[PDB]
């Protein structure tokens, strides 16, 4: 038979399943909605582990319980009460002789170690993953510190002092390739000659590589923090996502740069081989799976500024013209295309971030917090694991490096990249849509001439990389 | 077969504006969503006796994002312009979203609505008569929309539909 | 895509979850840790097809040895770890391949049995005598380094296949 349980007046957590408690879906269960009790049961629940469930429950859970409660409440959780001695351990007893306690030890092994277990593999989790409500709330710390260093008794002592250990690391806070990363490649301007650094005389590879590995950085940082509650549109986004808000940011910049190159070349000629080498740069990009750079390049070349340039896109390649149609189609269809490709790679890539985005605040928007059933309002937890499930594909292409050598110089040249320099978005913007207007008026306008203004060659050194011994 | 209108929902983030959409292609009677999923974005309709399909694209989120919303602008035929009733900054910003829109389909005279979403109960600081003046001026419709009775989501998209087809 | 369940298990201390963590994020950890249970997922490219790996780490100590049934029941395949400098863990192998035979109550499930440490000089646990193990079994045996990699993915995309091919 089931192993007996404690009274559920003195232990909550056995009160039995109902409807009024916990909803499943339609092979361990998959809960609907229930109440926090249910919830932090099944999160550590005697007949199996679930992982994922622990990760989803400590992303998401601030929605409906503070961090504070959830501490008291695994800490509940954790005292279970040991059942009295049964007919036949008491009649042992009466005679003098040493009980077998059959139900003692069985309850011991197969619910007060598992339950217990598991309770600290949440608190493992909760400081290795989740340190952040440590970092916010000293005294949550605080709490945690003390519950875990008086955890008494053996069975659970190897992973009692581990985790004191591993908190104590937290408070006070290298990779290795199956190969060698690329040379380094050169074309006009020199290594050290970083006044002479520009979109023209950089290496076009070596152009994708470098931003390939600072947008990688910047997709990398952004915990679930900065996106579950939709943090980064509310007032407080600067506090909350601020490493979201610098991976936009420098997305952004890096597509009104390509304008700003584009339409700041007033010479046709010239600009031809402007927009000639960023497509070259979307090539690279796109062997990288770089999706984000791909996309800064798209969007570029489909801003009122340049899509509008229809002389000097006449003078483009036909093959570099099939290479930019086959980019912007990744994104036709509300990214069909997309889509499909991020999930067939090889990583490491860089996604483009929002769709997750548009993805989570939708979810969040469009689902209820809680489920009424039965005069009860149960924390609808269906939609907390859609956004766990957002947050999870984007922390599984955060786990793989790139192997590309870092150029210092050519990193800090594309980190202090300004095209908008102290001018408003409107300000500049307008001016960018002035400058494609001066360089291709409209019809029935004639189209003017303009001087050259690079002095050095124009000529692409390509995009396949060379080899030195 | 039937006319597929491509619709694009822009405006200010933060206040609200995904509701609109949600709430159209939502299981109307059932308050649930899934946006992942291939089509919660298309929705076939009747509309004055015509059956057609309506493609939407909401970015919500993605304000940010300031350099693609050309890119995102230029795949619509129709446009929901959105603000808060209770944010007079989203209701400032309209101005300029309608320039953008203007400037990327290189037309005087883009089909668009005018919506003002009431988003939660904080007090209203955009009065009716305000919206009216300024859509009045544009030469375009207004039309108010509820984010939790789904009060006027219909009429706003309809009404995008009709001025689309009498363009 | 298809999904894939790996599961990692062996005696606490062989390095099951630097394995991991070297797979996933091309990073040695130094600490030792002992797991309760952790799981991880990588997209990755393997014969041409794309797929995706869920791979569940394992306790190792014996104070979580009463827990083992309920992540066996969900594995497909089984990396079978012991540390080739620690004799008692290689004698701790077959305690595993016997359990999850039981919960699955099959003769044929995808296994590789895996030396790992083999970057150190000291060795206890002789190639050759694994390698009789294995063949007892029907599966191949790796030796991996989760230190300096050598055999890492050798050892999770041989299990990939064996899956595949079951
Ligand atoms: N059927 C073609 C023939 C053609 C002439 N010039 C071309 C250049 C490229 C391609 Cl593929 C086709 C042509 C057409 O009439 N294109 C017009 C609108 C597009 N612009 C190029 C453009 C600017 N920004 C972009 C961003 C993405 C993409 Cl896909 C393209 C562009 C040209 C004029
Ligand atoms: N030299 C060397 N040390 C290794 C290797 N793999 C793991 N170690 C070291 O061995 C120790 C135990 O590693 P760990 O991965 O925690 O083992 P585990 O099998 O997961 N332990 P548990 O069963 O308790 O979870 C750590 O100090 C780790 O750095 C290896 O390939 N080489
Ligand atoms: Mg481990
Ligand atoms: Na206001």
């Excluded at chain 1, 909550?12 to 229930?34: H, L, V, Y």
């Excluded at chain 1, 306690?101 to 217990?116: D, G, N, T, W």
């Excluded at chain 1, 277990?117 to 005294?139: K, P, S």
């Excluded at chain 1, 407080?236 to 991976?247: A, F, H, Q, R, V």
Aim: glycine letters at 4%; a negative charge.
């Amino acid at each position: 038979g089931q192993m007996r349980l404690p009274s559920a007046d003195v232990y909550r957590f056995a009160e039995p399943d109902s409807e009024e408690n916990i909803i499943f879906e339609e092979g361990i269960p998959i809960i609907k909605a229930g109440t926090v009790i249910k919830l932090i049961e099944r999160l550590t629940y005697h007949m199996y582990a679930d992982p994922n469930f622990v990760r989803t429950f400590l992303t998401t859970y601030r929605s409906f319980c503070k961090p504070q409660e959830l501490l008291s409440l695994i800490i509940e959780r954790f005292e279970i009460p040991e059942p009295e001695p049964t007919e036949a351990d008491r009649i042992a007893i009466e005679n003098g002789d040493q009980p077998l306690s059959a139900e003692l030890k069985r309850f011991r092994k197969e619910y007060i170690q598992p339950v217990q277990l598991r309770v600290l593999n949440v608190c493992r989790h909760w400081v290795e993953h989740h340190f952040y409500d440590f970092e916010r709330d000293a005294y949550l710390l605080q709490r945690m510190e003390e519950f875990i260093g008086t955890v008494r008794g053996k069975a659970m002592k190897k992973w009692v002092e581990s985790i004191t250990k591993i908190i104590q690391r937290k408070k006070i806070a290298n990779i290795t390739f199956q190969s060698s990363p690329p040379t380094v490649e050169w074309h006009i301007s020199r290594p050290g000659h970083i006044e002479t650094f520009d979109l023209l005389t950089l290496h076009p590879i070596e152009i994708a590589r470098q931003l390939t590995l600072l947008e990688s950085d910047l997709y990398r940082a952004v915990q679930p923090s900065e996106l579950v509650g939709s943090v980064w549109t509310k007032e407080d986004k600067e506090i909350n996502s601020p490493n979201l808000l610098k991976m936009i940011r420098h997305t952004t910049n890096l597509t009104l740069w390509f304008e700003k190159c584009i339409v700041e070349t007033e010479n046709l000629e010239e600009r031809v081989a402007v927009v000639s080498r960023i497509i070259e740069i979307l090539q690279v990009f796109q062997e990288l799976n770089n999706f984000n750079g791909v996309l800064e390049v798209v969007s570029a070349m489909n801003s009122s500024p340049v899509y509008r340039l229809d002389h000097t896109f006449e003078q483009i390649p036909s093959r570099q013209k099939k290479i930019l149609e086959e980019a912007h189609e990744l994104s036709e269809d509300h990214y069909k295309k997309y889509l499909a490709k991020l999930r067939s790679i090889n990583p490491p890539c860089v996604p483009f971030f929002g769709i997750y985005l548009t993805n989570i605040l939708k979810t969040e928007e469009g689902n209820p917090e809680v489920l009424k059933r039965h005069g009860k309002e149960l924390i609808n937890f269906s939609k907390r694991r859609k956004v766990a499930e957002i947050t999870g594909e984007i922390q599984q292409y955060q786990n793989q490096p790139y192997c590309l050598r870092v150029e210092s110089d050519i990193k800090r040249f594309f980190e202090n990249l300004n095209p908008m320099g102290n001018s408003m978005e409107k300000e500049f913007t307008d001016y960018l849509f002035n400058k494609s207007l001066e360089i291709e008026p409209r019809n029935p306008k004639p189209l003017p001439r303009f001087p050259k203004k690079y002095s050095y060659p124009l000529k692409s050194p390509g995009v396949r990389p060379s080899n030195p011994r | 077969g039937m006319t597929e209108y491509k619709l694009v929902v822009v405006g200010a983030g933060g206040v609200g504006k995904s509701a609109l959409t949600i709430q159209l292609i939502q299981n109307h009677f059932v308050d649930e969503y899934d946006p992942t999923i291939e089509d919660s974005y298309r929705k076939q309709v009747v509309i004055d006796g015509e059956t057609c399909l309506l493609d939407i694209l909401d970015t919500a989120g993605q304000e940010e994002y300031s350099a693609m919303r050309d890119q995102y602008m230029r795949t619509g035929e129709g446009f929901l312009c959105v603000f808060a009733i209770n944010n007079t900054k989203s209701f400032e910003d309209i101005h300029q979203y309608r320039e953008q829109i203007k400037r990327v389909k290189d037309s005087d005279d883009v089909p668009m609505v005018l919506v003002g979403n009431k988003c939660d109960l904080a007090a209203r600081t955009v009065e009716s008569r305000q919206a009216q003046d300024l859509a009045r001026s544009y030469g375009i419709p207004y039309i108010e929309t509820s984010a939790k009775t789904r009060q006027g989501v219909e009429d706003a998209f309809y009404t995008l539909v009709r001025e689309i087809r009498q363009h």
